[PDB]
Design a protein around this ligand. Structure first.
Ligand code: CLA
Ligand code: CLA
Ligand code: CLA
Ligand code: CLA
Ligand code: CLA
Ligand code: CLA
Ligand code: CLA
Ligand code: CLA
Ligand SMILES: CC1=C(/C=C/C(C)=C/C=C/C(C)=C/C=C/C=C(C)/C=C/C=C(C)/C=C/C2=C(C)CCCC2(C)C)C(C)(C)CCC1
Ligand SMILES: CC1=C(/C=C/C(C)=C/C=C/C(C)=C/C=C/C=C(C)/C=C/C=C(C)/C=C/C2=C(C)CCCC2(C)C)C(C)(C)CCC1
Ligand code: SF4
Ligand code: SF4
Ligand SMILES: [Ca+2]
Ligand SMILES: [Ca+2]
Lengths: 80, 37, 141, 154, 31, 73, 154, 37, 31
């Protein structure tokens, strides 16, 4: 599985959660930004590594990173 | 025994086919059919 | 949760559907409550008639199920926002996958936990020399 | 209705179509009665049946198109080439059954089991070299076969 | 003036489709 | 041994040819540099090397081949 | 330690020694992958494998040293002698399995069972006469084999 | 095709060995190795 | 003046032991 690490530069704009078509990201409460929420990735075994969350993020050098690690049947996206 | 007509090679294989290969698979298919349940 | 209640929608049958991975490793199943008998495009291929009431559809990947959930939540004027995506094993067990907390992940609720959250910037990441033979990753540690 | 193409086995979500080529009555009574599929056989017999029809036709492309069709050793070179191909073929499928069916050893559908596929490999080898040697022996003595089909030995 | 081999093979090919059509008629007469 | 007699005109030979796909033209054309077997004319510089080193007969460089087998072991 | 010879399978009271000939890694991966020992095979296939390498080399000592090497019927007498030896060989081992595995019929290790050893006998006979006939056919047509290895039929 | 050199009998068996017998058992051993568990 | 068959067979035998020694090196490099 890949590793989706979310850094503290996140402003709680929740663009990455509604962009990811696999339901791995989700907004948890926080106290370090104006929106008082930060994205978090509990279901990292379902992430394929498509990096569609690293296309909709407003910070400089986007606060969410997807490190492409191991592969499996879910991370390679196989219907067979 | 030969053939003066056109395609003399053709009864050479059609006579053993209709003599052996057709009735053996016909009786095989029919005996499988009439004895099944 | 453990039992899937629904009827199959009206569909003629396709080729991009459930392959041999479904009865061997895993498959997925989306259940939703419709309003009318409208037409939806399944990610397998072609169109299908969405049955009235609670209906169930078996898919092969989770991405097809979430793509159908996006199609149910955006491309209808009676916006269907009460769909549940389960994971079905060949052993018979059914795992509730999405929206398993109960509320959609786009909005925040109390009860979640910050998994996989770092307390630094990306420029504050360590260098791969100090951990050159620890076996870990430069992003993990 | 009058539609001839439908969903495969009732449920329309399996990626297949019940079709007059795929799931006609004739197809599921002919493919289902082929040796690799018909019920009530050990894998040694069904491997022996599959092996014979493969050995019997592999003599052909080397006795008619192979490099020894120039000389008088035509059918001998055809047999030697087909014995090499069936030996490589049974090496491939016995190694396949050696590496695929290790582990859980599922009970039903005995062809897809390690002892079953090894029985299939033994059957394919016997039927393969036997069908090759019979097609070689019936091609080398073609003057005899022509004499006993035209009836000139009487 | 007599026939050729291609006419015999064309007769076999044009009679191949009555075999398929009689097979269809026999199948639907059985059921 | 036939190359050191006249190394200006005769051609060196790398090794021989043993593929079974050769017809008759590919055997009558690959019997070059005076050899009844099909050979392959060497284009690396091993012959001019072994002549400049001082090797004359085939026996001493065969013994060098056995020595390099022992050294590799 | 640095000692290479140890006790067999841990306990030092079994009358055997773990030795670089006996219990090396290469020995227990080569003998354990021989046909009589590797797992996942029916005894018919492993008997067919054991039979082929025995039939293929028994042609040799009679075509080169037998009494028919004087005449032109050299390989025919070699084949006849090897068919007699493999027929006596399969008679001996089928009678062995006929008399040893009567009674309790132990379940595991299916080679040492009466139906298993009879499958091994059928495999040894098929592989034996087939390896004998292939070595005879490849020795009788040795001019053809030399022509297709030197490449003079082109 | 023959051999004027010494031991002309030796490539006659070493060319099919390294062409067929060596790569078939190498690919057989490697396919058994890389697909086992 | 050329080589003999016994020199070729001796070359094969003296190169047989590098095959065993490279097999030993490959085995201990794997583990
Ligand atoms: C019903 C008419 C009829 C009859 C009685 C025969 C009879 C014969 N034909 Mg023949 N033939 C026919 C029609 C017929 N043919 C037609 C229409 C064709 C054109 C395709 C041919 C083409 C043909 C060839 C090319 C050859 C023969 C040959 C022969 C002779 C050997 C049998 C054989 O191999 O046939 C096998 C025939 C075929 C494989 C093709 C014809 C099959 C027909 C179309 C089926 C007839 C349907 C029939 C009425 C069903 C009866 C059902 C009943 C039992 C309830 C035999 C005298 C052989 C010969 O002359 O040997 C000396 C030969 O080489 N025939
Ligand atoms: C109607 C068709 C028909 C045909 C074509 C024949 C033909 C023949 N009969 Mg015959 N026979 C028939 C009906 C027929 N019979 C009937 C109804 C009876 C009962 C009264 C008999 C009773 C009879 C007797 C008592 C004898 C014959 C014999 C013969 C053969 C004489 C030459 C010979 O020795 O062949 C040599 C043998 C053969 C050619 C056998 C066929 C073996 C082929 C070549 C092997 C091919 C198999 C191959 C591997 C599979 C291919 C697959 C395919 C899909 C391509 C000849 C082949 C004589 C004989 O010796 O036959 C054995 C004989 O003594 N017949
Ligand atoms: C892909 C194209 C192609 C084709 C058609 C051929 C064809 C041929 N090559 Mg060849 N060759 C090719 C590429 C090809 N080569 C390449 C790329 C190379 C390397 C450079 C060579 C090198 C080569 C050499 C060195 C030689 C040949 C030779 C030959 C001839 C005999 C070989 C033989 O017996 O095949 C054996 C093939 C088989 C056993 C497979 C048969 C497959 C069957 C027919 C499929 C049947 C399907 C069926 C109809 C479907 C329905 C089934 C069921 C439902 C009813 C033949 C004409 C030889 C020769 O003498 O030339 C004349 C020869 O010495 N070839
Ligand atoms: C020195 C011991 C020895 C001997 C004499 C044999 C002899 C034989 N084996 Mg064999 N085998 C061996 C060890 C041995 N094996 C081991 C250790 C394994 C486990 C990897 C296998 C796995 C094996 C399989 C999976 C199959 C055979 C088969 C065969 C037979 C014909 C093909 C062949 O191998 O070409 C003769 C070549 C040799 C004798 C050289 C031996 C070198 C290695 C150890 C053999 C490895 C076999 C390789 C995977 C496939 C070879 C086929 C190739 C020629 C295309 C032949 C009787 C085939 C058969 O017909 O069975 C029905 C078959 O399918 N063997
Ligand atoms: C169908 C066409 C065909 C085929 C099959 C061959 C086949 C061959 N030719 Mg050949 N040749 C051809 C056409 C062909 N030729 C033509 C058209 C010409 C022009 C006239 C020639 C001219 C020619 C010459 C001049 C010579 C050959 C030689 C050879 C032989 C190579 C010796 C060998 O086995 O080394 C083993 C083969 C290799 C090492 C090459 C394989 C490299 C692999 C792919 C890369 C490594 C892969 C991987 C890392 C390691 C392998 C993995 C594996 C172990 C699992 C081989 C039998 C030579 C010979 O007789 O041998 C001394 C030779 O000297 N040929
Ligand atoms: C024990 C000594 C001995 C030896 C070596 C021989 C040898 C021979 N006798 Mg003989 N003979 C002997 C005793 C012996 N005899 C006795 C006591 C008598 C009775 C008085 C006879 C009576 C006799 C007769 C009447 C005749 C012979 C003949 C022959 C010759 C051919 C026989 C043959 O094909 O063998 C077949 C043998 C085998 C099939 C067994 C082969 C065993 C193999 C080689 C073992 C291989 C082991 C392997 C290398 C190890 C590694 C395996 C793996 C790990 C790699 C042969 C030279 C015949 C002849 O024409 O003479 C020239 C003949 O007509 N003998
Ligand atoms: C690395 C150097 C090298 C190379 C490229 C070749 C190449 C060749 N040799 Mg050869 N040979 C070599 C070293 C080499 N040899 C040595 C050191 C010996 C002494 C034992 C021989 C003895 C020898 C004989 C007796 C014959 C050949 C023949 C041949 C030709 C056909 C292939 C064959 O059957 O070889 C098979 C070779 C052997 C079984 C023994 C040599 C094996 C060597 C020692 C292994 C080389 C290790 C290599 C670097 C590993 C590469 C690993 C890489 C893939 C990662 C081919 C041109 C044949 C020929 O001339 O046909 C026309 C032939 O009859 N060779
Ligand atoms: C690099 C090695 C190599 C070698 C030595 C050969 C050699 C040969 N190829 Mg070939 N080929 C090669 C690579 C090679 N190829 C590659 C890489 C390709 C792909 C491009 C091809 C594609 C190719 C085609 C397309 C054709 C050939 C053909 C031929 C043969 C020409 C004569 C013939 O018909 O043989 C007759 C056949 C044989 C000699 C087969 C071997 C059977 C032996 C004799 C049986 C021995 C088994 C025995 C029981 C086991 C012994 C156990 C052992 C341990 C002692 C010849 C033997 C032609 C052919 O007809 O071959 C079938 C042909 O049409 N080749
Ligand atoms: C009709 C039809 C069809 C088919 C076709 C084809 C393709 C066929 C084939 C055919 C063939 C392909 C045949 C073959 C046959 C074979 C055989 C018949 C064989 C036999 C063999 C034998 C006789 C041998 C024996 C032996 C010996 C000799 C010794 C060794 C061992 C053994 C025992 C094995 C199809 C499908 C299209 C469809 C429908 C119609
Ligand atoms: C390498 C090595 C080794 C080995 C060696 C040897 C000793 C070998 C052997 C080899 C051999 C010994 C081989 C053989 C082979 C055989 C074969 C390959 C056979 C085949 C057969 C066949 C092909 C047949 C078929 C048939 C027919 C024809 C008909 C009847 C039936 C049948 C089907 C059976 C050792 C151990 C030292 C160790 C390590 C190294
Ligand atoms: S898109 Fe970037 S800034 Fe917005 S919530 Fe996701 S990680 Fe935070
Ligand atoms: S890589 Fe794709 S699946 Fe993973 S978090 Fe980013 S958008 Fe979602
Ligand atoms: Ca030719
Ligand atoms: Ca004598």
């Amino acid at each position: 599985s890949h590793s989706v690490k979310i850094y503290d530069t996140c402003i709680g704009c929740t663009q990455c959660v509604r962009a990811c078509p696999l339901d791995v990201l989700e907004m948890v409460p926080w106290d370090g930004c104006k929106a008082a929420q930060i994205a978090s990735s509990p279901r990292t075994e379902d992430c394929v590594g498509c990096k569609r969350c690293e296309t909709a993020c407003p910070t400089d050098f986007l606060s969410i990173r997807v490190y492409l690690g191991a592969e499996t049947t879910r991370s390679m996206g196989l219907a067979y | 025994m030969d053939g003066s007509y056109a395609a003399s090679y053709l009864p050479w294989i059609l006579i053993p086919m209709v003599g052996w290969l057709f009735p053996a698979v016909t009786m095989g298919l029919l005996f499988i059919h009439i004895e099944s349940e | 949760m453990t039992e899937l209640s629904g009827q199959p929608p009206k569909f003629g049958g396709s080729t991009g559907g459930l392959l041999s991975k479904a009865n061997r490793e895993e498959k997925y199943a989306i259940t939703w409550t419709s309003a009318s008998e409208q037409v939806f495009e399944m990610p397998t291929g072609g169109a299908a008639i969405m049955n009235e009431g609670e209906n169930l559809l078996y898919l092969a990947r989770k991405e097809q199920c979430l793509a159908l959930g996006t199609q149910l939540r955006t491309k209808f004027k009676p916006k269907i926002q009460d769909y549940k995506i389960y994971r079905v094993y060949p052993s018979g067990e059914v795992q509730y996958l999405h929206p398993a907390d109960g509320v959609f992940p786009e909005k925040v609720n109390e009860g979640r936990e910050a998994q996989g959250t770092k307390t630094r910037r990306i420029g504050q990441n360590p260098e791969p020399v100090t951990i050159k033979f620890s076996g870990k990753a430069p992003y993990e540690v | 209705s009058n539609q001839v193409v439908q969903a495969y086995n009732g449920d329309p979500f399996v990626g297949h179509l019940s079709t007059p080529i795929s799931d006609s009555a004739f197809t599921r009574t002919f493919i289902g009665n082929l040796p690799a599929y018909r019920k009530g056989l050990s894998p040694i017999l069904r491997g022996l049946e599959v092996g014979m029809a493969h050995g019997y036709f592999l003599i052909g492309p080397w006795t008619l198109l192979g490099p020894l069709r120039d000389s008088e050793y035509q059918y001998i070179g055809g047999l030697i080439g087909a014995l090499a191909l069936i030996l490589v073929a049974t090496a491939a499928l016995s190694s396949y059954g050696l590496v695929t069916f290790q582990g859980e050893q599922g009970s039903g559908d005995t062809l897809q089991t390690a002892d079953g596929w090894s029985q299939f490999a033994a059957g394919f080898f016997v039927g393969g070299m036997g069908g090759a040697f019979v097609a070689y022996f019936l091609l080398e003595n073609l003057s005899v076969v022509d004499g006993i089909f035209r009836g000139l030995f009487n | 003036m007599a026939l050729s081999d291609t006419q015999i093979l064309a007769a076999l090919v044009v009679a191949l489709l009555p075999a398929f059509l009689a097979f269809r008629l026999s199948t639907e007469l059985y059921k | 041994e036939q190359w050191i007699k006249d190394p200006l005109n005769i051609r060196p030979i790398a090794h021989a040819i043993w593929d079974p796909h050769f017809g008759e033209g590919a055997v009558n054309a690959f019997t070059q540099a005076g050899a009844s077997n099909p050979v392959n004319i060497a284009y690396s510089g091993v012959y001019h090397w072994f002549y400049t080193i001082g090797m004359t007969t085939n026996q001493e460089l065969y013994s060098g081949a056995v020595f390099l087998l022992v050294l590799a072991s």
